[PDB]
Amino acid sequence: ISPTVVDAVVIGAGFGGIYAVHKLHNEQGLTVVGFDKADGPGGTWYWNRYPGALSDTESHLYRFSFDRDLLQDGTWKTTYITQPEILEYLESVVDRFDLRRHFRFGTEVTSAIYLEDENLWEVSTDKGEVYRAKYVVNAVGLLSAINFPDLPGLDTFEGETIHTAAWPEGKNLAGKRVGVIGTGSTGQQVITALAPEVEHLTVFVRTPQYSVPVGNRPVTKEQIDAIKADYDGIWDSVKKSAVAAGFEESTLPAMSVSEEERNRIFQEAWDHGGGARFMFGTFGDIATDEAANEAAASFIRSKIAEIIEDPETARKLMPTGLYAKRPLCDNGYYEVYNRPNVEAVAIKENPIREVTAKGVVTEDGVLHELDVLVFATGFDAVDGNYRRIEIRGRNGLHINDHWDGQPTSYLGVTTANFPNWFMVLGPNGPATNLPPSIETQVEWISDTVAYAERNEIRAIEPTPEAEEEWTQTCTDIANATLFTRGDSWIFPSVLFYLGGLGNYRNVLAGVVADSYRGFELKSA
Ligand SMILES: Cc1cc2nc3c(=O)[nH]c(=O)nc-3n(C[C@H](O)[C@H](O)[C@H](O)COP(=O)(O)OP(=O)(O)OC[C@H]3O[C@@H](n4cnc5c(N)ncnc54)[C@H](O)[C@@H]3O)c2cc1C
Numbered sequence: 001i002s003p004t005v006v007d008a009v010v011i012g013a014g015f016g017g018i019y020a021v022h023k024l025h026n027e028q029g030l031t032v033v034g035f036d037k038a039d040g041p042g043g044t045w046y047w048n049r050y051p052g053a054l055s056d057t058e059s060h061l062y063r064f065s066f067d068r069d070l071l072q073d074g075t076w077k078t079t080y081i082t083q084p085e086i087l088e089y090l091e092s093v094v095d096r097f098d099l100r101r102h103f104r105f106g107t108e109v110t111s112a113i114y115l116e117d118e119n120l121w122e123v124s125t126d127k128g129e130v131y132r133a134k135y136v137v138n139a140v141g142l143l144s145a146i147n148f149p150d151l152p153g154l155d156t157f158e159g160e161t162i163h164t165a166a167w168p169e170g171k172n173l174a175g176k177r178v179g180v181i182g183t184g185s186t187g188q189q190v191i192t193a194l195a196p197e198v199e200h201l202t203v204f205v206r207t208p209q210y211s212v213p214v215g216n217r218p219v220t221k222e223q224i225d226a227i228k229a230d231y232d233g234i235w236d237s238v239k240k241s242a243v244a245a246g247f248e249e250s251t252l253p254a255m256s257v258s259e260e261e262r263n264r265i266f267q268e269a270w271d272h273g274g275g276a277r278f279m280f281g282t283f284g285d286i287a288t289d290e291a292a293n294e295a296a297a298s299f300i301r302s303k304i305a306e307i308i309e310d311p312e313t314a315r316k317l318m319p320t321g322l323y324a325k326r327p328l329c330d331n332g333y334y335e336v337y338n339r340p341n342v343e344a345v346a347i348k349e350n351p352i353r354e355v356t357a358k359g360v361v362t363e364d365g366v367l368h369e370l371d372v373l374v375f376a377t378g379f380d381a382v383d384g385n386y387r388r389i390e391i392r393g394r395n396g397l398h399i400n401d402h403w404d405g406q407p408t409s410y411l412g413v414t415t416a417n418f419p420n421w422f423m424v425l426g427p428n429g430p431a432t433n434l435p436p437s438i439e440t441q442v443e444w445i446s447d448t449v450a451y452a453e454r455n456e457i458r459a460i461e462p463t464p465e466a467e468e469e470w471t472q473t474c475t476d477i478a479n480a481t482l483f484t485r486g487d488s489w490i491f492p493s494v495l496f497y498l499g500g501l502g503n504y505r506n507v508l509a510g511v512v513a514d515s516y517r518g519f520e521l522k523s524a
């Protein structure tokens with residue numbers, strides 16, 4: 001059968017995909033079809049329904065900003081929002097802009113083959129059908145594939161095995177014996193939510209992490225209205241900031257003030273709450289200066305030692321090393337360990353021997369009775385959802401052979417040898433990866449497509465020299481941080497632009513004004 005021919009294909013129905021379909025169809029009038037493996041929209045907020053799921057950014061900012069009427073209709077109950085609220089918000093956006101009919105849900109894109117003679121992309125699905133399109137927009141997230149630790153004799157357990165990425169909604173664990181492995185952001189959130197309802201909780205710790213409070217407080221009607229009356233100024237300042245989190249970012253060097261004043265600013269941020277506020281709203285050299293970083297790390301350690309009453313229990317949860325990741329927060333995570341029904345096992349000192357029929361025995365002889373075992377282990381990286389599908393550009397070159405070593409890009413949204421092919425939150429993009437960052441990229445992509453249609457452009461792609469130049473820029477910015485030292489969230493090659501959202505917006509604007517510097521344009 002002959003494929004369906006459309007202007008644009010969109011892959012993924014999260015924040016990015018929803019916005020791209022709305023810009024491409026409703027604004028520019030282009031024919032558009034979108035896909036997602038999920039049975040509905042939501043993206044990461046469709047898949048992740050574990051108890052405790054929470055926004056890392058505050059409620060009034062964890063949403064779209066492009067529509068002024070939609071912002072004035074928003075509502076929320078606490079300073080942060082849960083997964084059910086975010087899912088309902090994205091579902092209502094889909095209905096408000098009549099986007100649902102443009103999507104094929106429950107469908108996977110299995111291949112994308114560029115045909116140079118026709119200057120069209122051939123897209124085929126796991127369910128049989130075939131499309132051809134002029135532009136492909138990839139909003140495929142960072143899901144990659146779930147991680148599962150193969151513990152000896154796993155399929156002996158007569159209980160339930162649950163991974164946080166596949167939580168069966170409505171599952172009731174009140175009154176059960178539960179184990180959790182994993183103490184990342186997801187583990188901390190699940191541990192906090194389960195502990196007041198379960199009969200017993202056993203946390204298998206491998207590497208404790210730094211975490212600050214979140215400060216999720218109730219909100220009144222008058223506060224929501226105050227935010228709504230200054231919405232334009234609020235978004236204008238967020239879009240010029242570096243981390244786009246709602247606070248003023250400090251330029252004050254940490255070791256330049258007295259120890260009393262340093263302790264006061266740390267404590268004021270800690271009482272407020274916020275991972276980003278603590279790392280970037282207190283001083284300006286926590287990520288760049290050794291002594292500044294140590295000061296913040298040991299302040300968090302002293303907070304953990306005050307909270308946890310048992311000193312032997314505090315020791316197992318005491319983090320060490322550079323305070324240098326994407327800043328975690330929590331809603332009473334440390335206090336959980338003072339409950340008498342919560343036990344912590346340090347896997348490095350007391351490793352798991354192998355799991356029995358109804359529990360896990362460890363190497364000192366103790367078997368912990370468990371009804372269910374929760375796996376809060378992670379996934380992989382950004383390139384995971386790109387490398388698992390057949391993507392072939394000019395001369396049929398595979399995306400794996402093109403990114404033979406490390407995922408590269410030009411300005412985070414394109415790559416050489418792959419014309420009319422764009423990435424939302426791809427490699428070499430900004431580390432800040434929230435809605436306002438998504439809006440920036442989807443808006444650049446939509447404008448570039450409009451520019452091509454108006455000026456009769458048949459194919460745009462970046463030059464290899466422009467791509468290499470962008471890689472140099474991301475590595476130079478990265479090598480001024482402490483992150484590089486040792487190995488941070490990286491591939492030996494950098495993986496993110498760390499200049500902040502405002503500097504990233506200035507780069508994108510300059511490229512367009514300079515007549516799309518870096519891109520070859522094939523006319524006619
Ligand atoms: C619990 C949690 C809390 C978070 N909180 C924050 C926060 O507050 N701030 C922040 O900045 N970030 C946060 N993040 C992450 C960030 O918001 C997301 O990375 C971002 O929303 C990505 O939006 P997206 O639309 O690009 O991708 P996603 O939401 O990940 O959606 C991508 C979609 O593409 C689909 N897809 C992928 N490959 C294919 C394929 N081959 N065929 C078909 N469909 C495909 C997937 O099914 C998926 O639904 C959080 C993440 C989690 C898990």
Ligand SMILES: NC(=O)c1ccc[n+]([C@@H]2O[C@H](COP(=O)([O-])OP(=O)(O)OC[C@H]3O[C@@H](n4cnc5c(N)ncnc54)[C@H](OP(=O)(O)O)[C@@H]3O)[C@@H](O)[C@H]2O)c1
Pocket residue numbers: 056147148149150181182183184185186187206207326376377378379433
């Ligand atoms: N960008 C944002 O704003 C934002 C916000 C929220 C969430 N997120 C994303 O959410 C993810 C974090 O959630 P997550 O907790 O699922 O991932 P994670 O950060 O990778 O945590 C996985 C946890 O499981 C442990 N673990 C993994 N394999 C193990 C094994 N074989 N044996 C024992 N323990 C094992 C890890 O310990 P070790 O560390 O010792 O290996 C770690 O504690 C990341 O992808 C992050 O980017 C992002």
